[PDB]
Design a protein around this ligand. Sequence first.
Ligand code: HEM
Ligand code: HEM
Ligand SMILES: O=N[O-]
Ligand SMILES: O=N[O-]
Lengths: 182, 182
Amino acid sequence: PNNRYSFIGGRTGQWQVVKIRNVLGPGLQLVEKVNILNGAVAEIPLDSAWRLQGFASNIRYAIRTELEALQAVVPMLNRAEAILAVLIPIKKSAQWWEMAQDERRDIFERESHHTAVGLEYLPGVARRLLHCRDLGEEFDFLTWFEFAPEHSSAFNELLLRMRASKEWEYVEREVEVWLKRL
Amino acid sequence: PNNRYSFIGGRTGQWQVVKIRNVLGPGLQLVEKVNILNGAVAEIPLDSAWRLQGFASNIRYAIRTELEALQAVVPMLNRAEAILAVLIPIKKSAQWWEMAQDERRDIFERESHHTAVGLEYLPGVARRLLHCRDLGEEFDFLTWFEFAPEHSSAFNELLLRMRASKEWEYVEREVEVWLKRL
Ligand code: HEM
Ligand code: HEM
Ligand SMILES: O=N[O-]
Ligand SMILES: O=N[O-]
């Protein structure tokens, strides 16, 4: 449908905030709930603390054989069992964005094995990647993960592996918003 | 800095329309002038026939050696002598966008030599690429070229070569707006 998603932190919404972890750089204000809208929001209610937005876009790095591997195991969003979610806004450094395409692909997969590592956690973890640097937002990406509680430990292990990678040496802001489906 | 540009076809603007060539698919209404703004415009003005918008973004295909060659030879915009320009909005097919990154890169450069051929013409041609598929626009890209009249025949030769390329088999809408500086 609409390629735009808005995440409004405040007092209403479909998701309850469990905790907010300020991984790197300035964090996000603590709020009660997150309201997720499949569209752009002009202004947020007075009782909202922040608004995040991003759009779904085309593939930027993954190659055909990687997409085939993902498609064989990828789970759908909105599984009945997937009552936990994590929203992770990420900003990468200017030095990352000034690099050419071969340099960034080399770091993303040849050195960091982003997709190969991520594949190990499917189909337990469902995901949605949104882009927002081109919208002028404070973050460059909004990443969304959801899973049943049984996979919480596996997801924490994934996070540890990702943040140890060469790719994460270019991450300059990151926040984790942990959520429970209402 | 603002990464957004709007092109408004209508009665006023910095560029006078010389001709519009509706190359492929639905065309653009003939107008007297094109007004170019470095920002977003909420609505299409009353006296305007169309409003196109796009954003400047990061590199998607060019590799380091290609980028070095491009950045070293491309002219600046708004040269005294560059009184001719061409605005070429382009839309690619759904089949293009569903391909993986290696598939699209291979078509763009390996099979079509987009950058290698373009570099032959770039010394006299200033260029700006803007993206707009992610904005929900009716085109996917807005391409902008400007040059002195002495290079008109060379630019037409470049267009002849690119429209014969494998990449152009995926172009499904294309309009040429030829302009003269006011
Ligand atoms: C759960 C398993 C995961 C899988 C299968 C996975 C897969 C992928 C793939 C294939 C891409 C590239 C999309 C493209 O080519 O445009 C990507 C991009 C990205 N992923 Fe993941 N990912 C996973 C987990 C994560 C996690 C846990 C994070 C953050 C903590 C994350 C952050 C990102 C970011 C920021 C990008 C954008 C990279 C860029 O364009 O520079 N991913 N992911
Ligand atoms: C004048 C010499 C030219 C040069 C040096 C050149 C170079 C380039 C480069 C390097 C890119 C890739 C940017 C990136 O990696 O993200 C690109 C993209 C593009 N160019 Fe050109 N170009 C030229 C002429 C043209 C012309 C005449 C047209 C249209 C008739 C055109 C249409 C496009 C389009 C539509 C894209 C976007 C491709 C995509 O992302 O799928 N270019 N050009
Ligand atoms: O792979 N980030 O949703
Ligand atoms: O290369 N199109 O600006």
